[PDB]
Scaffold this active site. Structure first.
Site, PDB file in Angstrom:
ATOM      1  N   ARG A  28      -3.676   0.268  -3.792  1.00 24.71           N
ATOM      2  CA  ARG A  28      -2.594  -1.068  -3.443  1.00 24.71           C
ATOM      3  C   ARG A  28      -1.378  -0.419  -3.137  1.00 24.71           C
ATOM      4  O   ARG A  28      -0.891   0.432  -3.701  1.00 24.71           O
ATOM      5  CB  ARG A  28      -2.469  -1.918  -4.623  1.00 24.71           C
ATOM      6  CG  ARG A  28      -1.614  -3.060  -4.127  1.00 24.71           C
ATOM      7  CD  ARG A  28      -1.929  -4.290  -5.073  1.00 24.71           C
ATOM      8  NE  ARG A  28      -1.077  -4.193  -6.239  1.00 24.71           N
ATOM      9  CZ  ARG A  28       0.091  -5.180  -6.269  1.00 24.71           C
ATOM     10  NH1 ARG A  28       0.412  -5.908  -5.606  1.00 24.71           N
ATOM     11  NH2 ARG A  28       1.077  -5.070  -7.523  1.00 24.71           N
TER      12      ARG A  28
ATOM     13  N   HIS B 154       6.310  -7.072  -0.772  1.00 23.62           N
ATOM     14  CA  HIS B 154       6.740  -6.473  -2.292  1.00 23.62           C
ATOM     15  C   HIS B 154       8.480  -6.540  -2.267  1.00 23.62           C
ATOM     16  O   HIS B 154       8.935  -5.317  -2.277  1.00 23.62           O
ATOM     17  CB  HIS B 154       6.042  -5.388  -2.498  1.00 23.62           C
ATOM     18  CG  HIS B 154       5.884  -4.767  -4.164  1.00 23.62           C
ATOM     19  ND1 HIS B 154       6.927  -4.974  -4.731  1.00 23.62           N
ATOM     20  CD2 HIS B 154       4.751  -4.802  -4.699  1.00 23.62           C
ATOM     21  CE1 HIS B 154       6.639  -4.724  -6.253  1.00 23.62           C
ATOM     22  NE2 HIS B 154       5.125  -4.386  -5.892  1.00 23.62           N
TER      23      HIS B 154
ATOM     24  N   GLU C  64       4.598 -10.955  -7.215  1.00 20.21           N
ATOM     25  CA  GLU C  64       5.333 -11.684  -8.338  1.00 20.21           C
ATOM     26  C   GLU C  64       6.438 -12.490  -7.609  1.00 20.21           C
ATOM     27  O   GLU C  64       7.511 -12.083  -7.786  1.00 20.21           O
ATOM     28  CB  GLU C  64       5.901 -10.204  -9.111  1.00 20.21           C
ATOM     29  CG  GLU C  64       4.887  -9.287  -9.573  1.00 20.21           C
ATOM     30  CD  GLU C  64       5.700  -8.324 -10.537  1.00 20.21           C
ATOM     31  OE1 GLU C  64       6.950  -8.165 -10.159  1.00 20.21           O
ATOM     32  OE2 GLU C  64       4.916  -7.887 -11.432  1.00 20.21           O
TER      33      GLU C  64
ATOM     34  N   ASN D 117      -0.478  -9.254 -12.507  1.00 22.15           N
ATOM     35  CA  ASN D 117       0.297  -8.257 -12.802  1.00 22.15           C
ATOM     36  C   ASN D 117       0.724  -8.479 -14.351  1.00 22.15           C
ATOM     37  O   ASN D 117       1.133  -9.487 -14.611  1.00 22.15           O
ATOM     38  CB  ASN D 117       1.457  -7.915 -11.967  1.00 22.15           C
ATOM     39  CG  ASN D 117       1.408  -7.633 -10.672  1.00 22.15           C
ATOM     40  OD1 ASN D 117       0.233  -7.278 -10.283  1.00 22.15           O
ATOM     41  ND2 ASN D 117       2.359  -7.327  -9.811  1.00 22.15           N
TER      42      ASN D 117
ATOM     43  N   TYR E  56       2.239  -6.483 -18.094  1.00 21.42           N
ATOM     44  CA  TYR E  56       2.595  -5.432 -19.050  1.00 21.42           C
ATOM     45  C   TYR E  56       2.564  -5.521 -20.386  1.00 21.42           C
ATOM     46  O   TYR E  56       2.577  -4.680 -21.370  1.00 21.42           O
ATOM     47  CB  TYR E  56       4.118  -4.974 -18.730  1.00 21.42           C
ATOM     48  CG  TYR E  56       4.025  -4.353 -17.310  1.00 21.42           C
ATOM     49  CD1 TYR E  56       3.443  -3.072 -17.105  1.00 21.42           C
ATOM     50  CD2 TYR E  56       4.568  -4.913 -16.275  1.00 21.42           C
ATOM     51  CE1 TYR E  56       3.582  -2.264 -15.799  1.00 21.42           C
ATOM     52  CE2 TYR E  56       4.561  -4.317 -15.147  1.00 21.42           C
ATOM     53  CZ  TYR E  56       4.080  -2.836 -14.955  1.00 21.42           C
ATOM     54  OH  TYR E  56       4.133  -2.259 -13.825  1.00 21.42           O
TER      55      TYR E  56
ATOM     56  N   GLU F 257      -1.534  -4.715 -11.199  1.00 21.23           N
ATOM     57  CA  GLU F 257      -0.541  -3.799 -11.836  1.00 21.23           C
ATOM     58  C   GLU F 257      -0.705  -3.752 -13.282  1.00 21.23           C
ATOM     59  O   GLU F 257      -0.600  -4.865 -14.154  1.00 21.23           O
ATOM     60  CB  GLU F 257       0.994  -4.520 -11.325  1.00 21.23           C
ATOM     61  CG  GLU F 257       2.268  -3.523 -12.164  1.00 21.23           C
ATOM     62  CD  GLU F 257       3.376  -4.533 -11.924  1.00 21.23           C
ATOM     63  OE1 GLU F 257       3.491  -5.383 -12.794  1.00 21.23           O
ATOM     64  OE2 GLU F 257       4.405  -3.950 -10.822  1.00 21.23           O
TER      65      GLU F 257
HETATM   66  C1  LIG Z   1       5.414  -4.784 -11.469  1.00 20.76           C
HETATM   67  O1  LIG Z   1       6.100  -3.992 -12.465  1.00 20.76           O
HETATM   68  C2  LIG Z   1       6.387  -2.616 -12.025  1.00 20.76           C
HETATM   69  C3  LIG Z   1       7.534  -2.097 -13.244  1.00 20.76           C
HETATM   70  O2  LIG Z   1       8.287  -2.907 -13.568  1.00 20.76           O
HETATM   71  C4  LIG Z   1       7.152  -2.620 -10.919  1.00 20.76           C
HETATM   72  O3  LIG Z   1       7.971  -1.176 -10.711  1.00 20.76           O
HETATM   73  C5  LIG Z   1       6.434  -3.016  -9.519  1.00 20.76           C
HETATM   74  O4  LIG Z   1       7.132  -3.098  -8.376  1.00 20.76           O
HETATM   75  C6  LIG Z   1       6.130  -4.435  -9.938  1.00 20.76           C
HETATM   76  F1  LIG Z   1       5.550  -4.967  -8.924  1.00 20.76           F
END
Ligand SMILES: *[C@H]1O[C@H](CO)[C@@H](O)[C@H](O)[C@H]1F
Ligand SMILES: O=[N+]([O-])c1ccc(O[C@@H]2O[C@H](CO)[C@@H](O)[C@H](O)[C@H]2F)c([N+](=O)[O-])c1
Ligand SMILES: O=[N+]([O-])c1ccc(O[C@@H]2O[C@H](CO)[C@@H](O)[C@H](O)[C@H]2F)c([N+](=O)[O-])c1
Ligand SMILES: O=[N+]([O-])c1ccc(O[C@@H]2O[C@H](CO)[C@@H](O)[C@H](O)[C@H]2F)c([N+](=O)[O-])c1
Ligand SMILES: O=[N+]([O-])c1ccc(O[C@@H]2O[C@H](CO)[C@@H](O)[C@H](O)[C@H]2F)c([N+](=O)[O-])c1
Ligand SMILES: *[C@H]1O[C@H](CO)[C@@H](O)[C@H](O)[C@H]1F
Ligand SMILES: *[C@H]1O[C@H](CO)[C@@H](O)[C@H](O)[C@H]1F
Ligand SMILES: *[C@H]1O[C@H](CO)[C@@H](O)[C@H](O)[C@H]1F
Lengths: 447, 447, 447, 447
Positions: free
Chosen positions: C76, C120, C165, C293, C295, C351
């Site tokens: 990606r 992006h 995002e 995405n 985290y 992500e």
């Molecule tokens: C998703 O999170 C990461 C980490 O913060 C960023 O670097 C990416 O650009 C984002 F799409």
């Protein structure tokens, strides 16, 4: 270079009661505004407080034995007001008095001259409950506290200071909210400052009337700011920064008025000094010396958004101590000459030192940066004496690592390391360096 | 704090020929007084010399590739006089000229403006054999050297400097004997200084007559001393210290006379300036800018035994770099304002840097103290620009660790580490720090 | 425990153009809002920017060779809009197109399926100058950009995403001011979000009309918050936190309306969605999958003072990564099940990764905490698949350490370490760990 | 985040007799089943045993001085049954009673409330020789033991617990054979569990009849399992895992029956609860509180081969403590809410802690992972209180590193390090961290 000091130069160290003593509930001690403050979540880092501290309420004999081997001639300490008058009350606590008699007699036994700070920030909470320093009744309460001490320790103490750092008591504490009681109101900070000054004048008046032994003064902390530009505005901003620390308290005492700019500045902000008939005369009571508390120097510029003084400090890239302060010792030389506007008065440096957080490693504390700091500042002291200024003594801040107010125990200023887990004292390398200087009565800078 | 620089601020780095080039016998290069000096036992630490050095005679393409990735806009370098005229002779060496054409064309190819120092201390020995700078025939010899360069590199070089640090060439070299040719005679140092100045004026005159491209100046090193006492004598001693570096060369150029105090001081010592009819007019030839070379600042006092200027520097206890110099960046701010006595002239900082001797560890050179040093001094540069002074650019001293004159290779000033065993370049952490500043065109100081 | 993945599970890694490419001025690339933002003092830590970055504009062949030995099936990446249309202009830049043909052909040559993110975050500055995303003309500009890519790379790319995002593009960027263009206005963030959605629907419509190869979706970042109390208010605060990230963009797309609570919440704050006739129909254009995405996860409570959503995150004491985020992988399991309200849609994790700042030591990067992080999250992926959810693939964020937006280069997410001084790639220990998992197509957790 | 606890929140620490006391043959102490077990080769790692242990039979005064400086309000300890009745015999050993009077009087002298566990696993071997807990005569023997303690320590102890962790006593010890007496027979584990419960009810009945001082409960260890899938089978497997620890003992006590599923599960395995007339009434004797012992949480799935509960724990990749347990503190929050099925009963957390094996290095034990663990779990405690649950106190497990049953001394849980070679106590960093929390009565989580 060799820097030889005067024969009768007074070498010492300095502490404050709440920072070292501990035993915060012992022997009828009342709570102070700092007990209350440190017991409030969010006020002091890690929720540290001065319960226990260095436990110097119990360990003072060791501390004095250590400072006696340092070869020092004074020891500056402060009196816990709420040990003596737990409610700021007129109801004396004899056990509190007995502690300071034990300390003072030990000092005197050891040929070490007490240098007594009466007020180092621990207002009884009882008095704060009524408005504490913003209330004129606190003036009268302080004068009784001072009088009690003058009467009790007459002839045992020859050096007295009414207040340590009025700027902190007033503006850091009641405008910026950083220190107890943590208020943020200009008018209240101005009220507090004014009432401190009246209480100071009245105490010095009582001292004189009683015929108490020794000499009495007040110990401001002293700002020095130097302008970023050559502009009139930057110059103005530095003048405000400098004057609020020293002149705002020293011009009343010496010259009978508050600094008119500043009066005008605060008036623009809607605050006026609550001056009553007779007040300025009281405040102008003659004093014998002042203590100057100095750490740092800044380069400032006018900035409308930079706090109530609109004076912004520029990070010039200088190295900083472990609490974040840049070291630039010339500021001491500069401000001492600055203060000659009040005449060639007797000045003791009653606080100078550095936060350097080195711990015990292989049995020692290799605090080379504290030695470096002290070296630099002692050169300036010599330098002013040699310019003919009546700088009479120097007290290192601090004998012991201690409770560093809002920073808690994290920030170590001591020449003796204290392990707060064990209460074990370990004199740092700066202690032995300092022992040599005070004993030789000269300093050498070497490559 | 953020410090934003002018859009057209000129960022660079600086070297000198004998310190980096090597190939001291190659292509018909004659010997200079520094070859002779460094080849004399006892003159340079460890008997180091500039045979080889950084071998930039051969490795200049790499050096330029590295400085091109630094994002720099100028490169200050000097011309080895004895490469061009091996006996200072009028007999040109074309191979010497060809080297500088290779360097200059590469620089220009890379969008990097040459900033050419004609004289950075390497007088042909042949000329010294006849008296070298004390002999007026050397004046004429320099003007031919300068003229040759102006004619050859017309249109390829737009920034020229006649002499780097006249105080060193004259007084450090001929009075204190520390630098080649290592003499110790006041009259000879004064003779040398005067003749440098005449040779400078004549070269600037030729520049103008030829219509050479660009702007031309001279690059004094600049002293700053501040008095220990408030005494008139200490003030006088600082004035002598400051003036011999800058004013002694700059007052002739700008105002048409030597500093009268100093003339009087040296006359007491039995030395007179060998001024001939027409000399002062020649020296007052208008110039386009000056370069200022700055490292340090001192606190001085009058001392009858402190050298020919009777001005003693006090070790104030400040931390020092690895060559032993204290860092106090305010001295740059102070002296730049001082120099406004000559008007708001164009000033480039043509040398500023620190000896910090960190080596390669885990593939990098963690020279945090060099970053700290540069940070501090770049704040002052910003500070003077913001005061309205025409400070046009800044050249870091030095691109490369190099031959540091009497200290030899022991004292490293480079932003790029050079292993003198391998000639391997390793950009230090300060190189990447500097790359960011010059590229962003702003500096941030942070805690 | 052994966790066996589906035979056709798609393993990959992910980057974004501005974070890796560099060559920000090369080949006619126009400036984006992130160039502008990162070139503004105070916006990005240390003044870092994406000039240069990983220099993947030049080094893509190495990157692809490395990801090819990782045994990965997708890659990606995103397209730099201003490489293709430097002013967002309709004036195509063929050199920009040629770069992505070089990348895509190499990928395809290596049996690695392109997974193309069109947007992006790098809006051409030219378009921002007119109001950028708050201006509906940007909608039309995006659709031409998308159409150009669909037409050029038809048959070479089978997986497309319109926007990465939307919550960041809209709310982080225009309400909280943290990301370019750094505005702080609710109405503008809502405008931006709405227009992104319309531009998304129109692009998917064009995709369909053109008969472009492959499948197309959108890749929201996905919040998960769990209430501190059992109170209705804490429950509400978590609902707002969760919904603004996902539902606010996904309910329009899937169900034809914005989340009514939230519409009501923002209306209380005086902001309304600028919905025009036909808009909601456009936005409801059918899509083939979404990228998620993920985290982190939080425990939140209602707090009136906690930002525009009045939802406060509690620091529960969990360990955190080197950028400060707690790791709690269950949040991935929870939100994937949450999203089933839209049906059992195809979801790729586009992500997931951790900021772990380990450097090269003895030739390797011992990033055990990144392996630990990925292990935990891949268990949850397996867990959802085994619950029957159509989770189709997983892309590790990130192939390379890169420009981490406002954190600059300080925060490393890569499975391959990049030394930004040399551009040297060093695959970390997590790279080899990941190579084993993707190649085996199973994961084992061990004690 | 700041987490302020209730004014009357009870802070403590916890030990058990056989784990700390030592002096296993001293003063007529009989052998317990754990002496026998640990003296059997192959049962305890390294053949470690509780002869000696922390020697708290002799060193209790130091332990109490240390816990008194911790600022703690309770101390949970257990009574060695075979010190009091060496053969479980009715023949009292006065020297055994005298030890606990010495401990209890010291505690009370220090303002520390005894929290007495009567049974922490040390059944006299004499009783086991007759069938020990599988024999109803042991019920009567326990009630005499309990009665003896109630009568002796009436008015000195205000908090009592009959049994610590019935699940371990019954199922870990008699089904899985891991703890003394190390049997592997379902029917015997069910017999033991039932008889513990009857002995518990009868002891609480005697407590009431005697008018003994204080409050009395029982302290189950508490399981929490969460299903891997959303399947009914995985849900069932978690229900069995959760219920056998808590409900199997708590439903009899509170609601008058065993959990019917489980009764049915065990019946399929051919085991029935030996319920006699009157038994369930006895067991339902009202109690004043319960202690909850919590460490960990799991994600489980149905697996036919996963032990007698057919419930498999999945290694989710979470980090684990040094004994191998994952830390997931939410499990405490979850199970506390779970237990509200029995009403909002008074709950003390009577055991929570982590095996973290850090030793003394430079004079301290830098057990940051134990602080991290405790921080996380104390947040959840605060969280439940703030949800209105009557969680009354928290006891850290353990004051001292001790004999960790089948793991021997290898697994350290203490807040004070014990060197078993010297018996030297060294308070760990978590001890000082905990001293601050209990003293301040609030917790702060920080980044
Ligand atoms: C998703 O999170 C990461 C980490 O913060 C960023 O670097 C990416 O650009 C984002 F799409
Ligand atoms: O003992 N006394 O009655 C007494 C009274 C007022 C005293 O002092 C007075 O106190 C007032 C507040 O109550 C202030 O407003 C006056 O400025 C102060 F002179 C003092 N004194 O300071 O020594 C003593
Ligand atoms: O070419 N020439 O014949 C020639 C001669 C003397 C020249 O210069 C003269 O040199 C004398 C020493 O020989 C100095 O005393 C004079 O001050 C200088 F004007 C120059 N010149 O400087 O351009 C050129
Ligand atoms: O080529 N065109 O003429 C053209 C025009 C408007 C187009 O799109 C239109 O753009 C307007 C802004 O200018 C938006 O307000 C409309 O929502 C959008 F449909 C498109 N398109 O999206 O394909 C193409
Ligand atoms: O002193 N006694 O005679 C006596 C006898 C049986 C006692 O208790 C009885 O013991 C039996 C086993 O021997 C159990 O089966 C009964 O459930 C229990 F009630 C008790 N008691 O628990 O207090 C006391
Ligand atoms: C002077 O400064 C020191 C360092 O901040 C404080 O600890 C003293 O209490 C103050 F008086
Ligand atoms: C300026 O100073 C540096 C450091 O001493 C020397 O290396 C240069 O040659 C001089 F020009
Ligand atoms: C609760 O758990 C700890 C740790 O396994 C044991 O040591 C205690 O004895 C038990 F009651």
């Amino acid at each position: 270079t060799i820097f030889q000091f005067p024969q009768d130069f007074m070498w010492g160290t300095a502490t404050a009661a709440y920072q070292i003593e501990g035993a915060y509930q012992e022997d009828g001690r009342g709570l102070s505004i700092w007990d209350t403050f440190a017991h409030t979540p969010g006020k002091v880092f890690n929720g540290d407080n001065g319960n226990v501290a260095c436990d110097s309420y119990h360990r003072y004999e060791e501390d004095i034995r250590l400072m006696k081997e340092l070869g020092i001639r004074t020891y500056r300490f402060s009196v816990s007001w709420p040990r003596i008058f737990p409610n700021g009350d007129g109801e004396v606590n004899q056990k509190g008095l007995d502690y300071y008699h034990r300390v003072v007699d030990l000092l005197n036994d050891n040929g070490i001259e007490p240098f007594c700070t009466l007020y180092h920030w621990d207002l009884p909470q009882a008095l704060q409950d009524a408005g504490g320093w913003g209330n004129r009744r606190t003036i009268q309460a302080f004068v009784q506290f001072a009088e009690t001490m003058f009467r009790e320790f007459h002839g045992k103490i020859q050096h007295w200071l009414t207040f340590n750092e009025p700027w902190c008591i007033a503006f850091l504490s009641n405008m910026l909210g950083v220190h107890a009681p943590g208020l943020t109101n200009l008018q209240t900070a101005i009220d507090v400052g004014h009432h401190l000054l009246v209480a100071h004048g009245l105490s010095v008046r009582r001292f004189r009337e009683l015929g108490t032994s020794g000499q009495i003064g007040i110990a401001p902390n002293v700002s020095w700011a130097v302008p970023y530009s050559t502009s009139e505005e930057d110059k103005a901003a530095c003048a405000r920064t400098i004057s609020l620390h020293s002149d705002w308290f020293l011009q009343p005492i010496y010259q009978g008025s508050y600094p008119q700019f500043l009066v005008d500045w605060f008036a623009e902000q809607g605050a006026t000094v609550p001056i009553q008939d007779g007040d300025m005369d009281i405040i102008g009571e003659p004093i014998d010396m002042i203590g100057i508390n100095y750490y740092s120097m800044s380069v400032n510029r006018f900035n409308p958004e930079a706090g109530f003084l609109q004076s912004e400090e520029i990070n010039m890239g200088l190295p900083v101590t472990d609490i974040g302060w840049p070291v630039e010792s010339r500021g001491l030389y500069e401000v001492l000459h600055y203060l000659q506007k009040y005449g060639n008065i007797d000045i003791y440096i009653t606080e100078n030192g550095a936060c350097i957080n080195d711990e015990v490693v292989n049995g020692k504390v290799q605090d080379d940066r504290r030695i470096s700091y002290m070296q630099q500042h002692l050169v300036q002291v010599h330098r002013t004496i040699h310019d003919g200024l009546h700088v009479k003594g120097y007290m290192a801040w601090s004998l012991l690592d201690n409770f560093e107010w809002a920073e808690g125990y994290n920030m170590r200023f001591g020449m003796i390391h204290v392990d707060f887990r064990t209460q074990v004292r370990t004199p740092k390398q700066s202690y032995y360096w300092y022992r040599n200087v005070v004993s030789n009565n000269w300093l050498e800078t070497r490559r």
